[PDB]
Symmetry: C2
Protein backbone atom coordinates (compact mmCIF):
# COMPACT_ATOMS: atom_id res chain seq x y z
CA UNK A 1 0.00 0.00 0.00
CA UNK A 2 3.05 2.34 -0.28
CA UNK A 3 4.12 4.01 -3.53
CA UNK A 4 7.85 4.63 -4.15
CA UNK A 5 9.41 8.11 -4.15
CA UNK A 6 9.00 10.10 -7.40
CA UNK A 7 11.39 9.01 -10.18
CA UNK A 8 12.41 10.49 -13.54
CA UNK A 9 10.90 8.84 -16.61
CA UNK A 10 12.86 5.91 -18.10
CA UNK A 11 12.40 4.01 -21.39
CA UNK A 12 10.44 1.18 -19.69
CA UNK A 13 7.79 3.47 -18.08
CA UNK A 14 7.69 5.83 -21.14
CA UNK A 15 6.67 2.81 -23.27
CA UNK A 16 3.88 2.05 -20.77
CA UNK A 17 2.61 5.69 -20.85
CA UNK A 18 2.75 5.72 -24.69
CA UNK A 19 0.91 2.34 -24.78
CA UNK A 20 -1.98 3.93 -22.82
CA UNK A 21 -2.39 7.07 -25.02
CA UNK A 22 -5.33 5.61 -27.04
CA UNK A 23 -7.27 4.80 -23.82
CA UNK A 24 -6.18 8.17 -22.31
CA UNK A 25 -7.59 10.28 -25.20
CA UNK A 26 -10.94 8.42 -24.91
CA UNK A 27 -11.35 8.72 -21.10
CA UNK A 28 -10.65 12.52 -21.59
CA UNK A 29 -12.66 13.02 -24.87
CA UNK A 30 -9.51 14.65 -26.42
CA UNK A 31 -9.72 13.71 -30.13
CA UNK A 32 -6.86 15.76 -31.75
CA UNK A 33 -4.40 13.48 -29.80
CA UNK A 34 -2.56 16.38 -28.12
CA UNK A 35 1.02 15.69 -26.97
CA UNK A 36 1.30 13.83 -23.62
CA UNK A 37 4.44 14.91 -21.73
CA UNK A 38 5.63 12.30 -19.18
CA UNK A 39 7.20 14.04 -16.16
CA UNK A 40 7.81 11.51 -13.33
CA UNK A 41 6.28 8.42 -11.78
CA UNK A 42 5.90 6.40 -8.60
CA UNK A 43 5.45 2.62 -8.48
CA UNK A 44 4.06 0.05 -6.00
CA UNK A 45 4.68 -3.71 -6.40
CA UNK A 46 1.49 -5.69 -5.59
CA UNK A 47 1.86 -9.48 -5.23
CA UNK A 48 -0.21 -12.14 -3.46
CA UNK A 49 -2.64 -15.06 -3.82
CA UNK A 50 -6.43 -14.90 -3.63
CA UNK A 51 -7.87 -18.07 -2.08
CA UNK A 52 -11.44 -19.33 -2.23
CA UNK A 53 -11.68 -21.65 0.81
CA UNK A 54 -14.70 -24.03 1.02
CA UNK A 55 -15.47 -24.64 4.73
CA UNK A 56 -18.26 -26.26 6.76
CA UNK A 57 -19.47 -24.55 9.97
CA UNK A 58 -22.42 -26.25 11.70
CA UNK A 59 -24.59 -27.75 8.91
CA UNK A 60 -23.79 -24.78 6.54
CA UNK A 61 -21.15 -24.52 3.79
CA UNK A 62 -19.23 -21.26 3.18
CA UNK A 63 -16.92 -19.65 0.63
CA UNK A 64 -14.05 -17.87 2.50
CA UNK A 65 -12.38 -15.36 0.13
CA UNK A 66 -8.91 -14.70 1.59
CA UNK A 67 -6.03 -12.59 0.26
CA UNK A 68 -2.47 -13.51 1.28
CA UNK A 69 0.10 -10.86 0.31
CA UNK A 70 3.56 -11.96 -0.82
CA UNK A 71 5.78 -12.47 2.27
CA UNK A 72 2.83 -13.60 4.47
CA UNK A 73 1.82 -17.20 5.29
CA UNK A 74 -0.50 -18.70 7.94
CA UNK A 75 2.62 -18.43 10.24
CA UNK A 76 4.63 -15.40 8.90
CA UNK A 77 3.23 -11.87 9.06
CA UNK A 78 -0.18 -13.54 9.29
CA UNK A 79 -1.73 -10.23 10.56
CA UNK A 80 -1.61 -9.01 6.92
CA UNK A 81 -3.84 -11.84 5.60
CA UNK A 82 -7.22 -10.29 4.61
CA UNK A 83 -10.67 -11.92 4.96
CA UNK A 84 -11.97 -10.15 1.83
CA UNK A 85 -15.40 -11.82 1.65
CA UNK A 86 -17.55 -14.50 3.29
CA UNK A 87 -20.87 -16.00 2.11
CA UNK A 88 -22.89 -19.22 1.98
CA UNK A 89 -21.50 -21.41 -0.85
CA UNK A 90 -25.14 -21.07 -2.15
CA UNK B 1 -12.20 -16.85 -13.67
CA UNK B 2 -8.40 -16.80 -13.14
CA UNK B 3 -8.85 -19.34 -10.28
CA UNK B 4 -7.33 -22.85 -10.37
CA UNK B 5 -9.33 -26.09 -10.22
CA UNK B 6 -10.57 -27.17 -6.74
CA UNK B 7 -7.74 -28.69 -4.65
CA UNK B 8 -7.70 -30.84 -1.50
CA UNK B 9 -6.48 -29.04 1.64
CA UNK B 10 -2.70 -29.00 2.19
CA UNK B 11 -0.61 -27.98 5.23
CA UNK B 12 -0.04 -24.47 3.83
CA UNK B 13 -3.72 -23.52 3.17
CA UNK B 14 -4.95 -25.30 6.36
CA UNK B 15 -2.75 -22.94 8.44
CA UNK B 16 -4.26 -19.95 6.58
CA UNK B 17 -7.87 -21.08 7.30
CA UNK B 18 -6.97 -21.73 10.97
CA UNK B 19 -5.42 -18.23 11.21
CA UNK B 20 -8.72 -16.71 9.94
CA UNK B 21 -10.99 -18.49 12.50
CA UNK B 22 -11.18 -15.49 14.91
CA UNK B 23 -12.33 -13.17 12.06
CA UNK B 24 -14.74 -15.89 10.83
CA UNK B 25 -16.49 -16.26 14.21
CA UNK B 26 -16.74 -12.48 14.64
CA UNK B 27 -18.13 -11.77 11.12
CA UNK B 28 -20.76 -14.53 11.65
CA UNK B 29 -21.53 -13.49 15.30
CA UNK B 30 -20.81 -17.13 16.37
CA UNK B 31 -19.46 -16.86 19.96
CA UNK B 32 -18.64 -20.51 20.94
CA UNK B 33 -15.86 -21.14 18.29
CA UNK B 34 -17.54 -24.12 16.54
CA UNK B 35 -15.48 -26.55 14.42
CA UNK B 36 -14.49 -25.07 11.03
CA UNK B 37 -14.07 -28.00 8.58
CA UNK B 38 -11.79 -27.13 5.60
CA UNK B 39 -12.95 -29.13 2.55
CA UNK B 40 -11.14 -27.77 -0.55
CA UNK B 41 -9.83 -24.57 -2.08
CA UNK B 42 -8.87 -22.82 -5.25
CA UNK B 43 -6.27 -20.11 -5.75
CA UNK B 44 -5.50 -17.20 -8.09
CA UNK B 45 -1.99 -15.70 -8.16
CA UNK B 46 -2.18 -11.90 -8.66
CA UNK B 47 1.11 -10.08 -9.31
CA UNK B 48 2.05 -6.80 -11.02
CA UNK B 49 2.99 -3.15 -10.47
CA UNK B 50 0.79 -0.09 -9.90
CA UNK B 51 2.23 3.05 -11.53
CA UNK B 52 1.29 6.64 -10.75
CA UNK B 53 2.39 8.50 -13.91
CA UNK B 54 2.54 12.33 -13.69
CA UNK B 55 1.81 13.68 -17.21
CA UNK B 56 0.95 17.01 -18.84
CA UNK B 57 -1.78 17.22 -21.54
CA UNK B 58 -2.35 20.67 -23.02
CA UNK B 59 -1.80 22.98 -19.99
CA UNK B 60 -3.18 20.46 -17.38
CA UNK B 61 -1.36 17.99 -15.08
CA UNK B 62 -2.76 14.46 -14.47
CA UNK B 63 -2.09 11.42 -12.32
CA UNK B 64 -2.32 8.31 -14.59
CA UNK B 65 -2.94 5.15 -12.51
CA UNK B 66 -1.75 2.20 -14.65
CA UNK B 67 -1.59 -1.45 -13.59
CA UNK B 68 0.96 -3.66 -15.40
CA UNK B 69 0.44 -7.38 -14.68
CA UNK B 70 3.54 -9.54 -14.21
CA UNK B 71 4.61 -10.89 -17.63
CA UNK B 72 3.43 -7.65 -19.34
CA UNK B 73 5.51 -4.62 -20.33
CA UNK B 74 4.96 -1.64 -22.68
CA UNK B 75 6.06 -4.05 -25.47
CA UNK B 76 5.06 -7.58 -24.20
CA UNK B 77 1.38 -8.59 -23.80
CA UNK B 78 0.76 -4.84 -23.53
CA UNK B 79 -3.01 -5.48 -24.20
CA UNK B 80 -3.27 -6.55 -20.51
CA UNK B 81 -2.00 -3.20 -19.14
CA UNK B 82 -4.97 -1.45 -17.39
CA UNK B 83 -5.70 2.30 -17.16
CA UNK B 84 -7.33 1.98 -13.70
CA UNK B 85 -7.85 5.72 -12.95
CA UNK B 86 -7.05 9.19 -14.33
CA UNK B 87 -7.50 12.55 -12.53
CA UNK B 88 -6.06 16.06 -12.39
CA UNK B 89 -2.96 16.08 -10.13
CA UNK B 90 -4.66 19.02 -8.30
CA UNK B 91 -7.50 16.67 -7.05
Amino acid sequence: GGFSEWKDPDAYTTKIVKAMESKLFEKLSLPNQPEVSFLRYREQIVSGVNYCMRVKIGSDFYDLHIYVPLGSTGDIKSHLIQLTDLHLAS
